Write a protein that binds this DNA or RNA. Structure first.
Ligand SMILES: [Mg+2]
Ligand SMILES: [Mg+2]
Lengths: 336, 333
DNA sequence: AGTCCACCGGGGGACT
DNA sequence: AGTCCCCCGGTGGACT
């Protein structure tokens, strides 16, 4: 659970355990002795807590101590089971830690859009925990899907064909000169629910916790929307980075521009909203870095920033609160 | 020495040791038990050798193995003086080795600029070791300088005043927002007239002695303020190994440079390139075929010119020469 | 001392 | 099984 419980651990099928001994099952070319079963840890640690949507105690806990819980728990399991034999490298901890921050944050945002899509339809503003109800004119036409995007995704895949053609048009004209414009992906993407999903349930149900089934619901959500999004319906991109290093600022910042250049540039979409979330900015450097303007629109168009802001959630609750407010505000020029 | 010498390691003061004990001299908020004197690893391992400029054994040795040596040596030294206890975290190495690759590869391009400048200036074309003499018609005006840029650098600081200025008339009608500049791992700038007769730009160097480390790391200052827009000839970014996400800083910087120099100071396209010894997944190459974003509003070329993978210190050196040999043509004799 | 910078390799899971 | 994708935190040194 969210607090290590040797009883819950004792009822774990050996293959649901958080640590995995592999001193007999060596990995190809890898010295790894014990694996961090990140999926497992998630379901153990967050089986029924979805931070921001749980106990007040939890919701306002320092968000770092929350995101860092799953690791703590697993290290305890290891020690308990293996003791001294136990050893895992910093880089495992960083790998998993960084993933968990991305997954859990998205889970929060998932629930945020549940509640949001409920109300948005003909539901109310669910009671608990208490968050300020939005003000905006409700409308089914104003629900949104929250797509935690997967490794080596291509954001362009979300778009409707007519828009994918414009682009592969463009690129072909580039390709005719030894020139490419590869597109990658943000860590997550909030889209406007395509019409024909506006009546579907799933986009309205808050989840109790990140159990395996529940994890999967989220990590796959994107598959449903591929080919169904309109250029202007990409309405928020987020990049997740637990801690910062001056060199690790550049993926979101570059892609952002590429998205702007295509969406805004070649498909006349409104300014593209792309932000970055971190729990550790290590100076001011990071902040000034993301004050950078958007490079396409520096050669008749209005100037705006590539990244709209750099955000550092204190609590899972603030994250909720922050996103509700964005939705309330951004879902305005959306005639419902 | 490039080969781990016991005797030498013993003949070593302790302020010289490649491995530092600090178990009783900790770092605020750090579990670091043993530090890596990476300046004492250059020194020890490369104090006599500058790859591609030493014996043929080195010059053509697998270049990964060369960069990998200081750290090999270090870990031997550590295991002799601290048999039970010697331990360092993966990430300590990853830092040191990354930097060494930046420094030494800069230290190879330095001796290149050296011997090339000599040629240009009317001295010989030295030939220890032999490299094909360049067919460019020499000139003191086609000398180049190889700046190993420091952490925190801003490459604009290299530009001359009237140029930095215009990067303000534009930049100032542009602020809640802005457009910062960072730095390539290294720059190659045309030597500026005022310096074309100094002798420091022509002396090659024997090893990476602290004195010598320091001369190459200091070099940039000498050129702050004194460089034309089109005289920025080449930018390199050193990444010893690649990870798909670790690809974007040279890509962005390049765009920004290209943006200002090319579109705002009407300079020639800018040559920006990456050197790595380990691309692992070949995402990278396709990644570095990206059109320059600036240019997609005007009329076009790659942002990053190429992604390069040196086999040997020698390959590195021959490549840079041909670059010069084909690029300085533009400079007027 | 304390603060900032930019190095990169060991990773768990998707996918084949 | 093999390969690839994107995670980040622990660092050695320049400054102040
Ligand atoms: Mg991320
Ligand atoms: Mg580099």
């Amino acid at each position: 659970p969210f607090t290590y419980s040797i009883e819950a651990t004792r009822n774990l099928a050996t293959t649901e355990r958080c640590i995995q001994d592999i001193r007999n099952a060596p990995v190809r070319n890898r010295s790894t002795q014990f694996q961090l079963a990140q999926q497992n840890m998630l379901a153990y640690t967050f089986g029924e807590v979805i931070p921001g949507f749980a106990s007040a105690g939890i919701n306002g806990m320092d968000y770092r101590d929350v995101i860092g819980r799953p690791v703590e728990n697993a290290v305890t399991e290891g020690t308990h089971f293996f003791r001294d034999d136990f050893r895992v490298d910093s880089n495992a901890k960083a790998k998993v830690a960084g993933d968990i921050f991305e997954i859990v944050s998205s889970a929060v945002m998932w629930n945020c859009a549940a509640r949001w899509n409920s109300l948005m339809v003909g539901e109310g503003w669910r009671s608990q925990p208490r968050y300020s109800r939005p003000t905006l004119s409700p409308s089914p036409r104003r629900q949104v899907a929250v797509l935690n995007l997967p490794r080596s995704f291509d954001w362009v895949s979300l778009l409707v064909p007519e828009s994918q053609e414009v682009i592969e048009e463009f690129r072909a004209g580039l390709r005719k000169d030894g020139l490419g414009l590869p597109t990658s992906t943000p860590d997550l993407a909030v889209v406007v629910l395509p019409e024909e999903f506006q009546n579907d349930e799933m986009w309205r149900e808050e989840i109790a916790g990140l159990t395996r089934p529940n994890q999967i619901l989220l990590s796959g959500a994107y598959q449903r929307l591929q080919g169904r999004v309109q250029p202007g319906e990409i309405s928020l991109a987020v990049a997740f980075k637990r801690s910062l290093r001056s060199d690790r600022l550049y993926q979101p910042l570059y892609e952002a521009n590429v998205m702007q250049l295509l969406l805004e540039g070649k498909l006349g979409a409104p300014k593209v909203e792309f932000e970055v979330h971190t729990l550790a900015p290590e100076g001011t450097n990071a902040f000034v870095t993301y004050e950078a303007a958007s490079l396409y629109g520096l050669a008749r168009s209005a100037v705006h920033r590539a990244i709209r802001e750099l955000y550092v959630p204190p609590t899972a609750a603030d994250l909720a609160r922050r996103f509700f407010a964005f939705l309330n505000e951004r879902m305005e020029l959306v005639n419902g």
